[PDB]
Structures are given as C-alpha cells and as structure tokens.
Coordinates of C-alpha atoms and ligand atoms in Angstrom, one line a residue:
X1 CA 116.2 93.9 105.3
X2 CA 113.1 92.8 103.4
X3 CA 110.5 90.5 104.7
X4 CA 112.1 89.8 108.0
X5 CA 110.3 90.6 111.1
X6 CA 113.4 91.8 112.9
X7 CA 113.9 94.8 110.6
X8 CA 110.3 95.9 111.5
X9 CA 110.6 95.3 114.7
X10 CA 113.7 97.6 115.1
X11 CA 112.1 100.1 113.0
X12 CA 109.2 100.0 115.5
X13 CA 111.1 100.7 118.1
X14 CA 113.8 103.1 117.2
X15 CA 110.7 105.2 116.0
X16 CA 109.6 105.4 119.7
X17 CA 112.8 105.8 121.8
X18 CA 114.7 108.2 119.7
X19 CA 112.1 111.1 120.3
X20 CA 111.4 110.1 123.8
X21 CA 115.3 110.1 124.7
X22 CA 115.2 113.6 123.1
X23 CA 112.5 115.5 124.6
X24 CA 113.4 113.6 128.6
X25 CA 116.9 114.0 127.6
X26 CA 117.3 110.4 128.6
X27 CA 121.3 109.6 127.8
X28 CA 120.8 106.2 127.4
X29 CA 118.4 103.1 127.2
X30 CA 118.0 99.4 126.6
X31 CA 115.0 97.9 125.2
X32 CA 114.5 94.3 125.0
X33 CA 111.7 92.6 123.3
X34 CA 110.9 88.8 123.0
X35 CA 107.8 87.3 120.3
X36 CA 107.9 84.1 118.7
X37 CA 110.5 82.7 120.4
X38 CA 113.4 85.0 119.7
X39 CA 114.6 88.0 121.7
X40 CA 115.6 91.2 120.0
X41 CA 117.9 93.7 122.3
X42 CA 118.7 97.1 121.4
X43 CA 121.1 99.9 123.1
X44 CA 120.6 103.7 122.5
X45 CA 123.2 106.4 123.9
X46 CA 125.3 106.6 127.2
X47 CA 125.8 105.1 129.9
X48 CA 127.8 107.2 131.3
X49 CA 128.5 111.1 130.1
X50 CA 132.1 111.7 131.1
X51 CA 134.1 109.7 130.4
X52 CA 131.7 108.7 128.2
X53 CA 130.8 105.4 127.6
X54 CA 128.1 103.3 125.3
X55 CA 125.5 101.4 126.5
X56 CA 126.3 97.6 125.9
X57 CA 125.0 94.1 126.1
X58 CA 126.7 93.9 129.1
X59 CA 125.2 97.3 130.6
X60 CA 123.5 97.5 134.0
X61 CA 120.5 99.4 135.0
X62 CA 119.0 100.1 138.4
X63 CA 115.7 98.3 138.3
X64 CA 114.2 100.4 141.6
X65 CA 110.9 98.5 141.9
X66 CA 111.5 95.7 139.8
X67 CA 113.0 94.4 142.6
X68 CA 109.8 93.7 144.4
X69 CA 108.8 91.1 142.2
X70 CA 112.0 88.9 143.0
X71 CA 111.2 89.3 146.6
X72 CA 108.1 87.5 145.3
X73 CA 109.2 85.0 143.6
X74 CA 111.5 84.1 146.8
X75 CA 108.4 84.2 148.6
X76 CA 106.5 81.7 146.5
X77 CA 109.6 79.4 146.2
X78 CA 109.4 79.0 149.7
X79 CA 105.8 78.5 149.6
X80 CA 105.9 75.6 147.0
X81 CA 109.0 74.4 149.3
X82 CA 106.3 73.8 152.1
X83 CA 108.2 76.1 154.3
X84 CA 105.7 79.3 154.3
X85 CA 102.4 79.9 154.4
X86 CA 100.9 83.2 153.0
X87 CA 98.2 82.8 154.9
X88 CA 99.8 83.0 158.4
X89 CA 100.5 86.0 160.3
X90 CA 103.6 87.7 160.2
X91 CA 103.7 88.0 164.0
X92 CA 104.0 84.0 163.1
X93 CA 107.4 84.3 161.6
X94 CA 108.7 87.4 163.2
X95 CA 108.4 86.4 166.8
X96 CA 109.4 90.1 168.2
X97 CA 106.3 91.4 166.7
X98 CA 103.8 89.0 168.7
X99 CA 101.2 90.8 170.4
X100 CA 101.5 93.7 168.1
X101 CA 99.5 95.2 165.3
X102 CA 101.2 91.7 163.1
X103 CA 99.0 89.8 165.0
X104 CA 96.1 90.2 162.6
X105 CA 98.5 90.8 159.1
X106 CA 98.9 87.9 156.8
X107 CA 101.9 87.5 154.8
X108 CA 99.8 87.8 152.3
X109 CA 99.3 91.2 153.0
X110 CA 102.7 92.8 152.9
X111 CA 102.7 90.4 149.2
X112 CA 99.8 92.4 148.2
X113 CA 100.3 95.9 149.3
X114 CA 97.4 95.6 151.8
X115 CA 98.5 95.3 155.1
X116 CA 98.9 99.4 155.4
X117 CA 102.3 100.3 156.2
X118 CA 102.8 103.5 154.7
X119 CA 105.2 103.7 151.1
X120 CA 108.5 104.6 152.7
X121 CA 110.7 103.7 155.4
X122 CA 110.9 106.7 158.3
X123 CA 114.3 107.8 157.1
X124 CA 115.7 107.9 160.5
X125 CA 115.5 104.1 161.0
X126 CA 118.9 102.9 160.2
X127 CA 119.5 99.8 162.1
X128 CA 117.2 96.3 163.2
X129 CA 116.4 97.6 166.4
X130 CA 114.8 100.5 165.3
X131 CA 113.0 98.8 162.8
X132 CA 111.3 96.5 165.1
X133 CA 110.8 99.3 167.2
X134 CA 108.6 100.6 164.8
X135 CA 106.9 97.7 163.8
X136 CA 105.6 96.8 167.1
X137 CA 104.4 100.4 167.6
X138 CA 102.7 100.5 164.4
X139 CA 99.0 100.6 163.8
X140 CA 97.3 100.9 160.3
X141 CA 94.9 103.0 159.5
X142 CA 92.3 100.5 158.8
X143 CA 92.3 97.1 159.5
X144 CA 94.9 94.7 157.0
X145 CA 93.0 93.5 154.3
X146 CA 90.6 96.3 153.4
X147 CA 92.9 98.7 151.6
X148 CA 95.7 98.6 148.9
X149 CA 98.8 101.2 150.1
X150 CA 102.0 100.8 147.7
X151 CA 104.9 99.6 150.2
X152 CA 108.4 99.5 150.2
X153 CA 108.1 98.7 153.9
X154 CA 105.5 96.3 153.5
X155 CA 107.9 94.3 150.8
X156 CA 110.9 94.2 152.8
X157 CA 109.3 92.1 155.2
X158 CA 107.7 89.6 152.1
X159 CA 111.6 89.0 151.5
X160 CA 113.2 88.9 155.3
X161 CA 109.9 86.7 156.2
X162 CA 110.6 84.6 152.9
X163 CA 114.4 84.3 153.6
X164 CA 114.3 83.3 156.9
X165 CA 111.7 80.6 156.1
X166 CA 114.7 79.0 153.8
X167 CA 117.2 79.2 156.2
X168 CA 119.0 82.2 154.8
X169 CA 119.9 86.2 154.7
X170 CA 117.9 88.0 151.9
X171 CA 120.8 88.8 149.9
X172 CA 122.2 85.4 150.3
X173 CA 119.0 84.0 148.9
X174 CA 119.4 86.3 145.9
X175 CA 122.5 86.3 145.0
X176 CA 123.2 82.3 145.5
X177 CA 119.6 80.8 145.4
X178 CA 117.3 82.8 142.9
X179 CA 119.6 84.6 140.5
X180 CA 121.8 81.4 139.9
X181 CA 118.3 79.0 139.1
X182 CA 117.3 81.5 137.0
X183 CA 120.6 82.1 134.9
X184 CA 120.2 85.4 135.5
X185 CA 124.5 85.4 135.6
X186 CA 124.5 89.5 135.2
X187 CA 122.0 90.8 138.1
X188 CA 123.3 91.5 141.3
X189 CA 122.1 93.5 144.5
X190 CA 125.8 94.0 145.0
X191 CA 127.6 95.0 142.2
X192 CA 131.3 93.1 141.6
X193 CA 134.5 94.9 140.8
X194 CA 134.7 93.5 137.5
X195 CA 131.1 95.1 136.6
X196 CA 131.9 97.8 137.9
X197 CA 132.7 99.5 134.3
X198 CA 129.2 98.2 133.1
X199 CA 127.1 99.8 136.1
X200 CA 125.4 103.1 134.1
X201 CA 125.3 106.1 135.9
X202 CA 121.6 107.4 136.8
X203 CA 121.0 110.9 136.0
X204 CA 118.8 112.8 138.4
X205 CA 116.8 115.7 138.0
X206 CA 119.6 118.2 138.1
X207 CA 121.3 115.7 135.8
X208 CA 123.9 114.9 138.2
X209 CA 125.5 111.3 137.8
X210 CA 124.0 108.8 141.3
X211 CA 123.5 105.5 142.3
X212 CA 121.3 104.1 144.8
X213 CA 122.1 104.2 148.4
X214 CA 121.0 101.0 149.8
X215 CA 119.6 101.1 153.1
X216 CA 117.6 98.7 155.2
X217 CA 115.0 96.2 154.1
X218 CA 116.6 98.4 150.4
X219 CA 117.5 95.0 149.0
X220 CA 114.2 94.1 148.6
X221 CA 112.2 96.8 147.7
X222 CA 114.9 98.5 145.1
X223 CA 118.2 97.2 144.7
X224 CA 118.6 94.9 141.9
X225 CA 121.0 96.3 139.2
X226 CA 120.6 93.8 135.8
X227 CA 120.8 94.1 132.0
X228 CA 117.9 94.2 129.9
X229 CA 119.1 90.2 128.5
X230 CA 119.2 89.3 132.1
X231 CA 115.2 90.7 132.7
X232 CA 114.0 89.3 129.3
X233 CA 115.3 86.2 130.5
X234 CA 113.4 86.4 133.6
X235 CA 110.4 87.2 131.6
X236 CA 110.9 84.2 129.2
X237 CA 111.4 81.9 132.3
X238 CA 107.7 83.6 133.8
X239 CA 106.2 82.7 130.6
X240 CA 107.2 79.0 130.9
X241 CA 109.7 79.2 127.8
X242 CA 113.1 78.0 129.0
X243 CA 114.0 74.8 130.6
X244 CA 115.5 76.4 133.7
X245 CA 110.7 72.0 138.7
X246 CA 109.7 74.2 141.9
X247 CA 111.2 77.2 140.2
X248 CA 108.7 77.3 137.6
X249 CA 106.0 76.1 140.3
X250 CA 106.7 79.2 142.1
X251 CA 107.4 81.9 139.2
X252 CA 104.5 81.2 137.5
X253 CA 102.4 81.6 141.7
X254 CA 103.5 85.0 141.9
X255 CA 101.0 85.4 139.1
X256 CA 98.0 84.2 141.3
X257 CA 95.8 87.0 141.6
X258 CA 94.6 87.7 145.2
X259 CA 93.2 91.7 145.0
X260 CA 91.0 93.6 142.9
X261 CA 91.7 97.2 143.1
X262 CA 90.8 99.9 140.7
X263 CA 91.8 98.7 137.1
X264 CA 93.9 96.4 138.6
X265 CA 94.1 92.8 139.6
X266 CA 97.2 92.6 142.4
X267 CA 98.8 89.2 142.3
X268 CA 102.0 88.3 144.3
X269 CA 104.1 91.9 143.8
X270 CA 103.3 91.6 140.2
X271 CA 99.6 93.5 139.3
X272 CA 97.7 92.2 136.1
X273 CA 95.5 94.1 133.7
X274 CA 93.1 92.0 131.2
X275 CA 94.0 91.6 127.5
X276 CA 93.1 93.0 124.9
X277 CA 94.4 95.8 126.7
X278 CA 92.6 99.2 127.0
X279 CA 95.5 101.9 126.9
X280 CA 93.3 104.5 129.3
X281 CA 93.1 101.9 131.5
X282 CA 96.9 100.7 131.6
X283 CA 97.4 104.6 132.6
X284 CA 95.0 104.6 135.3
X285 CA 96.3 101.2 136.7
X286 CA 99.9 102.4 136.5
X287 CA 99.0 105.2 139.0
X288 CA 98.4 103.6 141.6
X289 CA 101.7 103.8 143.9
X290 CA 100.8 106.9 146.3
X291 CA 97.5 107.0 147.4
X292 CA 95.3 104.4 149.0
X293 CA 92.6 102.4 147.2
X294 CA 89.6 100.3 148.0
X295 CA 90.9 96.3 148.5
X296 CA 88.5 93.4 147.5
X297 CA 89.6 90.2 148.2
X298 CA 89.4 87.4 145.1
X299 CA 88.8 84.0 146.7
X300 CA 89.3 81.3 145.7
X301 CA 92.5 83.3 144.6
X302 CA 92.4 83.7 140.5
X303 CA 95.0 81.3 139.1
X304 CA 97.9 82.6 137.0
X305 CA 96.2 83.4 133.6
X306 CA 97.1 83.6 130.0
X307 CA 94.8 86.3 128.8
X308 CA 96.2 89.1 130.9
X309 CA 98.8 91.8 130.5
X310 CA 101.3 91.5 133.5
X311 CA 103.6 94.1 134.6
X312 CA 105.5 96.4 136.8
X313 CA 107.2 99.8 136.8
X314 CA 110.2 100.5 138.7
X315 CA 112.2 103.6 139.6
X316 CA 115.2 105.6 141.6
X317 CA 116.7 108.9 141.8
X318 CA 118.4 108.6 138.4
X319 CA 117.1 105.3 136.6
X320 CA 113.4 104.4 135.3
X321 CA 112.3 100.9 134.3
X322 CA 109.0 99.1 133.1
X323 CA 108.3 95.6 132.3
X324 CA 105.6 93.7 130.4
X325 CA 104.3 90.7 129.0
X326 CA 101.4 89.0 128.0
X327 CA 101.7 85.0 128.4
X328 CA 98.5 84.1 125.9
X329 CA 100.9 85.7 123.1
X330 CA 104.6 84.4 124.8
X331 CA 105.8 88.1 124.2
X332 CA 107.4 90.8 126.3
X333 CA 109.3 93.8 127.0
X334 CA 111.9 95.4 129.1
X335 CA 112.5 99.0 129.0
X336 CA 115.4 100.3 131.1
X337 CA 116.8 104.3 131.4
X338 CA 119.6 106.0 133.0
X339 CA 117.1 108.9 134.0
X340 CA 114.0 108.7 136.1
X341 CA 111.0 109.7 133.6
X342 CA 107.4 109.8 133.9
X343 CA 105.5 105.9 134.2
X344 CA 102.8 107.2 131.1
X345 CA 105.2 107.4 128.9
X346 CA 107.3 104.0 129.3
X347 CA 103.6 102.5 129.5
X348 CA 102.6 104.3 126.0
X349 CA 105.6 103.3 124.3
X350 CA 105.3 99.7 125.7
X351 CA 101.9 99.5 124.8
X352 CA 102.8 100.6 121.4
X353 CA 105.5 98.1 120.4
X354 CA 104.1 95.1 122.1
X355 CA 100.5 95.8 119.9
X356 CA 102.3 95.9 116.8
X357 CA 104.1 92.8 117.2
X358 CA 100.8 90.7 115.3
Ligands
CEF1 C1 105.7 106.5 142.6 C2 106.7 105.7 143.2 C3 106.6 105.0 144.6 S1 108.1 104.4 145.2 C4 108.5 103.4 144.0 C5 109.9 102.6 144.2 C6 109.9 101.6 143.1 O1 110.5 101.8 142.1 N1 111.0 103.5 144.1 C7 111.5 104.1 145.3 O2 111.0 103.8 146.3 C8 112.6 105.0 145.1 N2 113.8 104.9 145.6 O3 114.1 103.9 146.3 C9 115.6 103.9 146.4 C10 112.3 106.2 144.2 C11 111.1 106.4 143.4 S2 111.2 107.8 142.7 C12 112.7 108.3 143.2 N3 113.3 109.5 142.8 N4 113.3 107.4 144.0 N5 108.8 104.1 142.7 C13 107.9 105.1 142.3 C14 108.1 105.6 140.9 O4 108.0 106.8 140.5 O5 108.4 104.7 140.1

C-alpha cells in the first residue's frame, strides 16, 4: 500500500531476513518491531521441519541470554521493594558462603558481570550441594569489582539472591510474580502442554532438531522460551509505554548504568551503547561475552537515559535472539531464530531497520 509506513516498514525488513535466512539456512524467524506507538510482527519459515509447521503469532523461541535481563528486573523489583540492597555482600544473603571469597562481592557484582566467576557452570555440578561447594572454594582472579567476565554463574546467583529476598523460588517469582505484572501471558521457563505445539524446534549446527536442557541456576541465565509479541511487550513496558507502580520503578533501574567497559556502559544485565549509534562500535561492544575486560566503576551510578541504545543478545545450541531499543525515539526490536547464528549479523540487520525507521 501507498503512503503508509507499515508497507515500508515490511519492505524493510523482508529485504534483510530473506537473504540472511538463506545463506545461515535459518528455517524460521520472528521479527517484531515497535515505532510510533504501534508494533508490526512478522513470521518467516518453520518452526519445525518435519512435520512441518509455520512459524505463528503464537510461536515460541528460546531466548538463551535474554533471560538474564529478567533475573534483573526481579532483582530491581526487590530492590525498590526495600527488600535488597545491591550494595551488600552476597555472603549477606547466602549465609553458607560467609567467610568465603563472597565476603568482599556485592550483589552488584554478579548484576554487572564483575564479580569474576568464570562464564559457565563446571558441568559436573548437578545438585545445591555441589554448588555451594564450589562457591565457598572459589577465588577470582582479581579482586570483584576490577574486571568485567560474562557470567552465567554470576547471574544465577542475581536471581536466587533476588528470589529469596521476596520470599520465593526463582521460578515461582517468574512464572507467578514477573511474567503475570508484565502481561507477558506466553513466556514461560516451563513450557505447558497446551504450548507444547507452539515451542519451535532449535536447529544446531549439524541441523538436528534440540531444546535446551535446563540445569541448575539454567532458569536464570537461559531458560525463558517467549514469542516475539510477548518480548516487544516487555520492551514497550521498559520504555514506559503501557500502563502495566514499583514495576515500572524497577524495569526502568535495571537501566542504571554502574560499569564502563570497552564501548560499553553495563547497567543492571542489560549493557547500553550511546545514540546516534556508531555501527563499528555496536560490533565491538557486542563481543564482549568471552574474554575479560578492564572494569571502571561509574559513581554516582548513571541514571537510566533516553539518548542511549539498549540491548542484549541471547543464544543456545539451536536458537539465536537479539534485542534493541532506543527510549529517546520509543522504538525497538526483537529478532528471534530457530538456529544459533553469528551476533554481527542480528546486530547489522538490527541496526539497519531500526535507522530507517525516521
Ligand atoms: C558467547 C556466548 C556466551 S554464553 C551466552 C549464553 C547467553 O545466551 N548462552 C549460553 O550460555 C548457552 N547455552 O546455555 C544453555 C549457549 C551459547 S552458545 C551455545 N551453543 N549454547 N551466549 C553466547 C552467544 O553466542 O550468544
């Protein structure tokens, strides 16, 4: 149609996802976009390959990493509930680890990526007991506080720390606390039996059809599944758009930036590059998850801006997400894939549509 904004903005994006899909053989993909107000979804391909099926409105996606950012939120909610302080010690919550190395780690820490706990849980720890057993014998390379190191281990204990500060499990919190406030109806960490026929298979890198395998302190650090309405939602509602007042308080204080590292500003999960945004630069800051970096400390803390592009990739062995937004111009995008494929690209092709959308 002529002289409507939607037509372009499909147009836009069909131009980018088609050949992408092609040459990662990607089988199938939702991209949701919101600007001016309105949200535009669009489906491409399959979400499974035999039998096949569509991708829907109704389709899920594992999120891998995305999931990080909701243990934030739960984090800040209890924070602007009075019943956690980031700046304590985590030896302060999680008694068993008093007179450890948790002595001299702030909660803020593991909510920044700086406490030093490596990227991945040990694979052999399997159980609570030999978690904590590993905790207490743990000692970081340099002291907390100096150093960004990506953590899945580090996040997992933002979310138990933050759910035992309200008085509940992790998944509990979720699934009957978070989730519900936010609408978000379709996102789960569990999947039900009745969205069962929605879940997309991941394809890996032999393109066999997988799904996560949750294991412990997984809920936190990678298990959401979700459609792309349910994320652009959750974007909206962290750019201050829907009605939904402590859950705004706290969505919108995970955007608090504490760390400067690299091209990067780290807030609460959730890392921030400034806007106008230089595309190099959104490369460089986007590969950031496996090394160690220098940390600098921003204090006073920055306070959740407007002129700022905010984002986070996410991954797992056979999905690959991305989201972005940047509040001054209350717009966004979700990008979700049933097969894992490389972070430059999903930040290109964001970077593309959301700079042509004014
Ligand atoms: C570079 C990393 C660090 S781990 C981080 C994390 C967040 O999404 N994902 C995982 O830890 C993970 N599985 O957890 C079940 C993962 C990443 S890549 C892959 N084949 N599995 N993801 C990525 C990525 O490529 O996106």
């Amino acid at each position: 149609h002529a002289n409507i904004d939607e037509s372009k903005i499909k147009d836009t994006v069909d131009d980018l996802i088609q050949p992408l899909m092609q040459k990662n053989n990607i089988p199938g993909m939702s991209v949701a976009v919101t600007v001016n107000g309105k949200n535009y979804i669009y489906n491409y391909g399959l979400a499974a390959k035999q039998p096949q099926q569509p991708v829907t409105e109704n389709t899920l996606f594992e999120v891998g990493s995305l999931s990080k950012t909701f243990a934030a939120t739960l984090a800040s909610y209890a924070q602007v509930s009075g019943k956690l302080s980031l700046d304590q010690s985590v030896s302060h919550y999680v008694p068993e680890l008093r007179g450890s190395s948790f002595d001299h780690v702030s909660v803020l820490n593991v909510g920044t990526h700086t406490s030093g706990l490596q990227l991945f849980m040990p694979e052999d720890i399997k159980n609570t007991t030999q978690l904590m057993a590993y905790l207490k014998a743990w000692k970081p390379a340099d002291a907390a506080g100096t150093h960004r190191v990506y953590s899945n281990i580090g996040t997992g204990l933002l979310g138990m720390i933050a759910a035992k500060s309200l008085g509940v499990s992790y998944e509990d919190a979720i699934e009957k606390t978070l989730l519900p406030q936010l609408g978000m109806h379709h996102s789960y960490l569990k999947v039900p039996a009745d969205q069962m026929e929605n879940y997309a298979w991941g394809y890996n890198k032999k393109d066999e059809p997988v799904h996560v395998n949750m294991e412990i302190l997984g809920n936190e650090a990678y298990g959401i599944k979700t459609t792309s309405s349910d994320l652009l939602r959750y974007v909206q509602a962290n750019m201050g758009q829907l009605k939904l007042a402590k859950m705004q308080q706290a969505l919108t204080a995970t955007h608090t930036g504490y760390f400067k590292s690299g091209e990067i500003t780290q807030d609460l999960m959730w890392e921030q590059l400034p806007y106008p945004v230089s595309l190099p630069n959104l490369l460089t800051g986007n590969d950031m998850a496996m090394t160690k970096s220098v940390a600098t400390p921003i204090v006073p803390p920055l306070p959740p801006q407007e002129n700022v592009w905010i984002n986070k990739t996410g991954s797992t062995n056979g999905f690959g997400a991305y989201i972005a937004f940047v509040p001054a111009k209350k717009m966004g995008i979700v990008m979700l894939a049933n097969k894992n494929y490389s972070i430059d690209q999903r930040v290109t092709v964001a970077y593309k549509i959301l700079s042509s959308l004014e």
